[PDB]
Every structure is written in structure tokens, then in C-alpha cells.
Amino acid sequence: VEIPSSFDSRKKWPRCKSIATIRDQSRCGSCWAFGAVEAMSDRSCIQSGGKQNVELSAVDLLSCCESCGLGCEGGILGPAWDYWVKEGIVTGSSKENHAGCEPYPFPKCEHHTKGKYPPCGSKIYKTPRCKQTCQKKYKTPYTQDKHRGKSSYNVKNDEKAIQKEIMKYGPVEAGFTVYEDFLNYKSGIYKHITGETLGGHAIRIIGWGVENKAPYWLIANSWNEDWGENGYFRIVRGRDECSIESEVTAGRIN
Ligand SMILES: *[C@H](CS(=O)(=O)NOCc1ccccc1)[C@H](CCc1ccccc1)NC(=O)[C@H](Cc1ccccc1)NC(=O)N1CCN(C)CC1
């Protein structure tokens, strides 16, 4: 199939509201779990033809996966997708929406940026306990509410492979290196110019494009809609910028 110069998963599958959803990790290094459950929500809607249109629970994955790392202190992308395949993940919304089996326990906050929510600040919440019980008003049994993948995999470190993967099966999760200057992103096509290495971040790549011939990936962040470009950012595409093409992970429901 031919690779178009631009592609946006929202435009290909507008019936799948999750693709346009911007989540908030709050004061927790749960990015690894957010990029996973977000892409899994998108893919479940895409690949099921809408029979599974759910918002999967970040807290179920964050709190219960034992092979996924350190919870709010950082996690591992491959095992997150394997957990979805082997154990499954229940439904759950933001704290503010208080919907689904296991809604997120932590409130929206601003991630080194201006807006109406309280600043996230420096403190990191303790990883929630693995409870495996739905909220009181949610009447579907926890075990019955589990949504499972069929397979998971790493995507090849190759721009065209990543493009084809997205177009065919939907958004992917990806890891990239956070340098200091990323925390001051407001708009544009990000690349590392200044600042030392801080750590890594895990996000959802939903498409790609070009601006004045400069290629980029279109990424949904998990720092709420006030951050960046309405919750999204763009980053240089095709030069493994901040290792953005090096840790791409996804999976399928069928
Ligand atoms: C999610 C990133 S974030 O919380 O939104 N913060 O943005 C990056 C940042 C900024 C300042 C300092 C450090 C990082 C989390 C943050 C985890 C964390 C780091 C430092 C202090 C508290 C919490 N990042 C991860 O979960 C990353 C994901 C990733 C994997 C591979 C390649 C790129 C990204 N993974 C980790 O941080 N892990 C991996 C597993 N080990 C066992 C723990 C650390």
C-alpha cells in the first residue's frame, strides 16, 4: 500500500472517540500505562468495528501488572502489552468522569505549563494498590469487564514500518528520551536543542504530517488538553529524534 504524505488516525476512524481523547497521568509516572491503555482502547474500537468501544482503565494496568516495573516510578512497554493479552484490562475513566469499573484515582494537574488546573508540582503519589474490584455503582463483575488483546509486539525501528503499522491497525505506543527542553514545549515541531537527559516518556503516536516540508509525528500526550497543542505534540520524524522510532510497541485484538 502507498504511504500518504500525511495521516491522522482520528480522520480514518472518527467513530472511535478514544482516538481524540487526551488523558492526564496526574502526579504519577504512569505514562507507560497511559500510552498502552489509550492505544489499546483505540485499537479495540478500530479492530472490532465498534463492538468494543471502551475506555480502558489506566489504574488496573498500573496497579496490577507485576512484571511492568515500578508503577508510578516508571514502567516497561512490552510487559504492559503482554499483560493486556494475558490478563486483560477492565474499563475506567478519569477521576472526574468517575465511570467504568476502575476510574483513575488521581486528579488533573498542569505538567510544567499554564492552565486552569493546579500545578502538578514535585510530589509523586504512591502506586495505587491492586484492588481487582469495580467501583460500587459499576455493576458488571470485574472479571467480566476484562478486555484482552490477542497478540503484542515490538514494531521495527523504521519510519515506513511504523507508518504502515499505524495506518493498518491504529495508534501505537512509543518511548522517547526526555531532555530538559521538552518540559518547556508549547507548540511546533519538537526536537532536542538544549538541556540534559532527564528520563523517558511513553506516549501514543496517532499519525504524521509535514509543515513547510519538515516531517513530523503527531503524538497524543497524557498531560491533559492544556499542555502543548491541545494536548498533542509534534516531533521530528525519520531521524530517530530522542529515540522516538526505537521503542514502538503495539498489539491486536484479533
Ligand atoms: C512517564 C513519563 S512522565 O511522568 O510523564 N515524565 O516525563 C519524563 C521525565 C521527567 C523528569 C524526570 C524523569 C522523567 C514515566 C516517568 C517515570 C519516572 C521517572 C522519574 C521519576 C519518577 C517517575 N516514564 C516511564 O515509565 C518510562 C517509559 C519508557 C520506557 C522506555 C523508553 C522510554 C520511556 N520508563 C521508566 O521510567 N522506567 C522503565 C522501567 N524501570 C524499571 C523504571 C523506569
The class by helix and strand makeup works out as: alpha+beta
Note the overall shape. globular
What helical percentage do the residues reach? 10-25%
Ligand set: ligand VS4
Beta-strand proportion = 15-25%
CATH architecture: Alpha-Beta Complex
CATH class: Alpha Beta
How many angstroms separate the termini? 21 Å
Count all strands and give the number: 8
Give the C-alpha Rg: 17 Å
Main sheet makeup:
8 strands, mixed
Number of domain units = 1
Fold-level CATH name: Cathepsin B, Chain A
CATH superfamily: Cysteine proteinases
Helix-strand pattern: EHHHHEHEEEEEE
Number of helices: 5
Domain Peptidase C1A papain C-terminal: 3-252
Modified residues (Cysteine sulfinic acid (-SO2H)): 31
Disulfide bonds: 16-45, 28-72, 64-130, 65-68, 101-134, 109-120
Keywords: Disulfide bond, Hydrolase, Protease, Signal, Thiol protease, Zymogen
Structural commentary:
The structure is a monomer. With 254 residues, the protein is α+β, with helices and mostly antiparallel strands. It has a single domain, classed as Cathepsin B, Chain A. It has five helices and eight strands, in the order E-H-H-H-H-E-H-E-E-E-E-E-E. Strands 1, 2, 3, 4, 5, 6, 7 and 8 form an eight-stranded mixed beta sheet that branches. A hairpin with a 2-residue loop joins strand 5 (197-211) and strand 6. Helix 2 (31-47) packs across helix 3 (58-64) and helix 2 packs across helix 4. The longest helix has 17 residues, at 31-47. The radius of gyration is 17 Å and the shape is globular. It starts with 6 loop residues before the first strand and ends with a strand. Bound molecules: ligand VS4. The ligand *[C@H](CS(=O)(=O)NOCc1ccccc1)[C@H](CCc1ccccc1)NC(=O)[C@H](Cc1ccccc1)NC(=O)N1CCN(C)CC1 binds at residues 25, 29, 31-32, 69-70, 73-77, 124, 175, 178, 198-202, 247. The modification Cysteine sulfenic acid (-SOH) is found at residue 31. Belongs to the peptidase C1 family. One of its GO terms (biological process) is proteolysis. The modification Cysteine sulfinic acid (-SO2H) is found at residue 31. This is Cathepsin B-like cysteine proteinase. It is classed as hydrolase.
